[PDB]
Amino acid sequence: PSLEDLLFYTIAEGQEKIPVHKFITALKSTGLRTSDPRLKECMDMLRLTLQTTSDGVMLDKDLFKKCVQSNIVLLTQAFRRKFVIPDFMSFTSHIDELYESAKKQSGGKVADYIPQLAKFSPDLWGVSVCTVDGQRHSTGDTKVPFCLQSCVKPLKYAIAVNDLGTEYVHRYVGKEPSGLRFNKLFLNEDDKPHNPMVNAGAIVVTSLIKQGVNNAEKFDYVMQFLNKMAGNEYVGFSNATFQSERESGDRNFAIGYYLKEKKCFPEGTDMVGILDFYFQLCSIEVTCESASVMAATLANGGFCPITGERVLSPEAVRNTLSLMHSCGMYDFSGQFAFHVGLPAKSGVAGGILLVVPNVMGMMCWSPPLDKMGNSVKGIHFCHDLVSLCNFHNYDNLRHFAKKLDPRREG
Amino acid sequence: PSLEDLLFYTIAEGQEKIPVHKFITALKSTGLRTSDPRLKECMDMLRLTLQTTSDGVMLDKDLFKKCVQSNIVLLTQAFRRKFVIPDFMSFTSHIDELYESAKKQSGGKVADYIPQLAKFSPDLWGVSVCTVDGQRHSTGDTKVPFCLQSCVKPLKYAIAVNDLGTEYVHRYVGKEPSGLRFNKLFLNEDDKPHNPMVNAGAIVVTSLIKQGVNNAEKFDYVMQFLNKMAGNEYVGFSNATFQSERESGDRNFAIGYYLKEKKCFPEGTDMVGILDFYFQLCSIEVTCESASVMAATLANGGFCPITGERVLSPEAVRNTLSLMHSCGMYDFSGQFAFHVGLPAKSGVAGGILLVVPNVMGMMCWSPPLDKMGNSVKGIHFCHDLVSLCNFHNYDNLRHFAKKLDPRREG
Amino acid sequence: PSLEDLLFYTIAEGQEKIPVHKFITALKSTGLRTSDPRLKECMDMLRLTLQTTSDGVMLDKDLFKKCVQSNIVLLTQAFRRKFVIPDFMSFTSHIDELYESAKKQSGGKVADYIPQLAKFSPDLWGVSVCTVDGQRHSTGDTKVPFCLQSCVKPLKYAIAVNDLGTEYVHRYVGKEPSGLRFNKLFLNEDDKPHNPMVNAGAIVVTSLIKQGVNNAEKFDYVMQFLNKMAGNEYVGFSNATFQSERESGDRNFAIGYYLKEKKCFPEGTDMVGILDFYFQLCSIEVTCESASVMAATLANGGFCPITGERVLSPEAVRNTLSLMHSCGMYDFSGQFAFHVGLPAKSGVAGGILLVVPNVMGMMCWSPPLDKMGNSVKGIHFCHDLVSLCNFHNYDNLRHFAKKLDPRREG
Amino acid sequence: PSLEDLLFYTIAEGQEKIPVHKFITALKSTGLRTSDPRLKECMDMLRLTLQTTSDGVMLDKDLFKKCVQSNIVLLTQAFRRKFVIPDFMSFTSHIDELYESAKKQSGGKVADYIPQLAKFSPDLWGVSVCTVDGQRHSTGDTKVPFCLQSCVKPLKYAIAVNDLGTEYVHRYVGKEPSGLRFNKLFLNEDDKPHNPMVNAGAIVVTSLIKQGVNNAEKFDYVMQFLNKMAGNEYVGFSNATFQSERESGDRNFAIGYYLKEKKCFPEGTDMVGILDFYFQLCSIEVTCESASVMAATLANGGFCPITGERVLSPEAVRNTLSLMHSCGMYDFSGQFAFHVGLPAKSGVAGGILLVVPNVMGMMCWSPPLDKMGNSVKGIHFCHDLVSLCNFHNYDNLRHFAKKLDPRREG
Numbered sequence A, B, C, D: 001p002s003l004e005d006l007l008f009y010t011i012a013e014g015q016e017k018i019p020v021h022k023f024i025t026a027l028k029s030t031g032l033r034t035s036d037p038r039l040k041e042c043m044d045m046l047r048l049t050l051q052t053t054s055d056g057v058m059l060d061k062d063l064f065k066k067c068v069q070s071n072i073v074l075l076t077q078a079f080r081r082k083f084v085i086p087d088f089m090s091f092t093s094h095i096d097e098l099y100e101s102a103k104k105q106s107g108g109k110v111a112d113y114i115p116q117l118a119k120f121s122p123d124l125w126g127v128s129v130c131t132v133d134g135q136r137h138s139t140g141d142t143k144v145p146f147c148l149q150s151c152v153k154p155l156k157y158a159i160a161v162n163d164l165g166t167e168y169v170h171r172y173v174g175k176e177p178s179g180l181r182f183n184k185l186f187l188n189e190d191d192k193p194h195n196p197m198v199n200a201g202a203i204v205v206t207s208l209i210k211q212g213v214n215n216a217e218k219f220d221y222v223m224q225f226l227n228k229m230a231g232n233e234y235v236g237f238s239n240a241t242f243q244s245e246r247e248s249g250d251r252n253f254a255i256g257y258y259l260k261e262k263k264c265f266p267e268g269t270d271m272v273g274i275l276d277f278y279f280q281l282c283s284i285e286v287t288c289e290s291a292s293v294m295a296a297t298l299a300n301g302g303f304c305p306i307t308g309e310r311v312l313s314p315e316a317v318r319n320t321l322s323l324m325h326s327c328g329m330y331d332f333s334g335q336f337a338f339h340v341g342l343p344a345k346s347g348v349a350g351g352i353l354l355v356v357p358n359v360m361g362m363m364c365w366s367p368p369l370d371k372m373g374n375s376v377k378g379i380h381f382c383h384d385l386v387s388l389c390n391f392h393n394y395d396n397l398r399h400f401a402k403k404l405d406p407r408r409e410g
């Protein structure tokens, strides 16, 4: 009694076969998108079948088996409701309420220190969800590219710890928040930057990646790495933001020369080239949709959820989530850690890279920032989310009062 | 087919009578103690039955049913391996190796500013486990009484947030760590102590509990909460420690008056009386085993694991856990959050109150402190614990490299 | 060839028989007062001759000599214009213009944290001058008693360096200003208060004075010493201030307990007793006129200018003046040192103890303090004084542009 | 009678003619140099007279008049012993004692971050005196050129206050010492550097001087300014140290970008070019003797003591001396102010620019620095000088215990 046939009848309702649209609809309702890389063969076999019989197609059991056999295990988990969020249709309904609610918060100031950022309209607002099992949901402007800015800091920290290990990386950068009044100091008592989530630390981290090769190859290697983290969804580069960040960033040059003088770089660092590498990394483009997959790689222990590929070592993933917890929303980090309890990372383009470990990854994006540098809609969304679901890090998974737990049906 | 029935067949394993000791040995091997408050009716019936039938010692199906009918639900989960840690026998093997490995860590200095903590032998070393289901295990000197000291700061903060709620409590005290040299500034920029886990924060929080009645009743009020949290195991009091804490507490007096000058207490606070209360709360005694139940209650979203009693609101538990994470280990807080990633609190007696949310609570006691005030052996144990098991708060439950997950078997 | 009437003709004006009023008036015109202790005998001989005769009286070349012979050398410099300010009468004319100019300044708030300090009227305003030669001038409420408060800090520090020397004293207290927003810290990086002019330093200084003996005898000794410093003009004690300063002294008890815990006191100190002694010293009363003598003892290298008695070692006077320069006006100290350039010390009763080295001492008193604790009228008077005369510590004695030099005559 | 003649009678001492050498020796012993600018006429006539009348050579009274007539006033004060240090031959013997004492202090380390200062032998040790009246004395290596380094910081600040006034300049820089081990902060809380005497402060002052012209002209305008201050003694320039200072100046570029980002420079500043000007001003060369004249101009209210020329406004001179008092010896400033009480500035090349207000200026030079950056020999010298002489700024001029007063005689 084989899986492909049990599934066939589970979808077959006792009618002797299954219309293709009716398989596509049942698939989409599990959260999986028909373009999921892990479903390629199934979809290739489907489109081959719709070249044959162009009147239908209506699939019997061996023809259904013919398409679905290569992806049956992933399909059985989808259809039997084994994903981390079983009733994904209900849950994306709540995401949308949360989306509409936060959309009413028009406050904040679009970052304008740079013309590329000032140009973005304050009304742009998108939330994208990718769960640990590949369930996708978007609402809003989830396909408009924008710059990762400081959202790239946890990613490139991840890469560095991935390639070099925790111990090496933290020879050069701390692992604690500075305290709501060393905001302004570049270095802790040990003469290292306080953590990889602030600019001095991000800049040092940058000097660690793929040492020995030139900047063009370093950027290629980070790009190929982001490509894997996003399951080959959109990752681009904004040369306008780049040129302009590097002509309008005296603060970072001040940090660079400070780091150089205190001997904060590995031996042989070319500090002015590192800053230029840094500015490019800040100008990498993503969409809400592709950036949520990247977070979901981090929610999923370093496996990209829509491709199954191992992208980052668990160590790198745990360090990254750890520092995003305490250091990820700038001056709001401790408040965010207390009330939201989620690892998150914000950037000046208006994005919050949000990770719900073991559940989902998310990317919120609205250009208007509050006075601490965080997207107003983004922040408002993060508070709502944790007020709704027991996703706060220290919510209890058994006794969670009247909050909703999307991981369950009852 | 009733459940006391199905389970009777589960234990009988072929025979039609079950020897009593066979049911007891099966019970103990689930981690449950035979003294479990949730098992009293069943254990009273087994005692009575052995009195009225020394012509055994074997339990019919009808007889086994008269004994377990009371506690059948729990006994079901214990026996159908439904507890948070199913193979508890193997897990305690690991706790014992962890215990032995930390035991060989002879360094440190016993706190001798009081002649009551100075008396304790450096060789005392105890580790007690109580899971979210009541599963108990202890190794080492887990029945020696010692003073909580600063391990009581999360407990009384939890009581404050329980009775008064998050917004009121944090009018008087912050929710962030300070910075690894703001250890000496009693106040943050809003003239609030930084968090409840430092002395000025504990002192201010002590002043929010049971306002308006004397220290006799305030104390009894807190003790009664500490009894419910520990499932009514040992919660004592060391008047010897308390007299010396108050004869030798220049700094807290420095803090108390400084707090009074800055208007940090609620209106009509008798600060010098609040310091005396505070010194009393520090002198409360526990054992590794009784305190492990307190940790387990915070592990369990505020329900005591061996009684089923709701002791704390989720809100209280979530805040307490949030702040033990980032502030609970003094100047080691940030490194502890990074490498161990578990809510913990330490005290100058040598305790570390340890919480694995949704899994278990623990208490580790060894008096010799490292130069940052934390028990050497406790600290070494906590690192090994999370090297071995995917209990780091930002470990992943599905992809955890070479770590072991005791929540599943095979 | 006698000095005694190379002078009576200096006074005689060709006429050969000097009236008394005309000798007193010429005396007063030099700045000396008819009650100068150095002039007692000459005034004793005048009191006797004024009863030998009611018909006059007046003097000739031998009963003049009869009265003045005892104090001739001091009289000769007085009448030959050899004092530090020759044309004293035009100088008091400027002090009066400075006085009245500052009286128009109604800003400020009278310290009211003490009902004694809130008792005093905002309209009180007095400036008192005593030069290094005993020349006196007053204008305004220069006889109203008021507490020294922090004005006593340089005095008791002087006494302390006097009795124990520079090296011993600075084992316990620093000799620099802190940094204009590390006022809040009680201890520098060596665990000493920053300087004797802040409350932590003053409190440590208080613990050095007359160690071994008790508070009643210690207060008598400071009083004897203040009495010498002030040429036995008015010094007293306000108990109302004392009792109110010791009820409302939470900050000082914070310093006391902080100091004791960091082991900041000489071995054997009774901290709580030192604070009461400290509170007494702040309650010591003076007048403008009497305090200006105390300042003039410091202007004059430690000799009281109206008795000639050597009250303080030079060491003590230099150290005191050094630190009143940099630390004596609280958070205004560095501005004050920059613009006024005079060793000065303020207190919350409204007093500015002002010293012009090698020239004069003063006491300004007006109770309305500014936002930084300094008497408004006082500060304003001090700026005017240095705008007008080249008394700025880094004015040039030879080239000084538009400024007047009262020490000269062209 | 005439003053040339009266003075001729005093040097002739009975005979009818004064040998020329008898008059030169009389003049030199006053401390004046035979090359004094204010003496060129008299000295030109003396050389011309030894040509036109080789017959001797002895100056009758008519011939002595023809030589000293144009310089009679200065020669009078020189010979009626009316200079600020009357017995200059006795005081120089003391400077020589102070010199040789401090010579035996071979400790400290020569600045080596730049090759051209690692050049200098650790045994070079020169002390030069120039009084407020032109009396000169040198001992040691007083004609070796060295770089002003930070000794230029009071000079250019003076130039800036001279041309711009106190109020404008101190919109851009403060006037207080920072706080010891608060040397790291480039900015105080008004986002101004702390004082002109630290690098951030100096760099901002550099950008106020002569806004609107290129570095060629800014530099020349400062140089001609230093020249007048040195009475046209040697004021050089080490293009070697400038090129090197600019290659290895990471901290300064760090300061530069930091200040530009904080909007610390006058509008329209070319910060990179301001840094190059700054590195130039640091490379200006002097000698002990020439810089001793620059300090003497600061000793003398801004008049160059050997030319009579007004160089700096008294305001400029008083601010500079105020800030050298509190901020001029790096982290030793507060200790230096306390024990030396003399306006001084130090530099990495080994120089201490020292000012005894109203008396003399000095340059001590020895390349080995102590750990705080201050010349070990210079520091040792300054302490000896003030232990010997009542030159401490808060020494008393009339009561100075056993200290010696070189302003006095018998």
Ligand SMILES: O=C(Cc1ccccc1)Nc1nnc(N[C@H]2CCN(c3nnc(NC(=O)Cc4ccccc4)s3)C2)s1
Pocket (backbone or CB within 6 Å): A181, B184, B185, B186, B187, B188, B189, B191, B258, C184, C185, C186, C187, C188, C189, C190, C258, D181
């Ligand atoms: O330990 C050293 C040596 C040392 C070492 C290294 C450098 C300097 C000094 N010195 C000292 N540490 N602590 C001292 N005094 C205790 C009594 C009063 N205390 C205060 N608590 N909070 C304060 N500030 C605010 O509430 C406001 C604020 C918040 C954030 C930023 C700015 C202002 S004052 C602590 S003395």
Ligand SMILES: O=C(Cc1ccccc1)Nc1nnc(N[C@H]2CCN(c3nnc(NC(=O)Cc4ccccc4)s3)C2)s1
Pocket (backbone or CB within 6 Å): A184, A185, A186, A187, A188, A189, A190, A191, A258, B181, D184, D185, D186, D187, D188, D189, D190, D191, D258
């Ligand atoms: O912050 C204000 C005043 C201000 C301005 C406005 C409002 C309030 C206060 N001014 C300024 N902030 N930042 C400035 N410049 C940056 C250049 C690199 N700087 C560093 N200095 N020190 C660092 N770390 C250590 O030394 C290690 C350590 C930490 C703790 C204890 C002991 C040692 S990094 C900061 S200048």
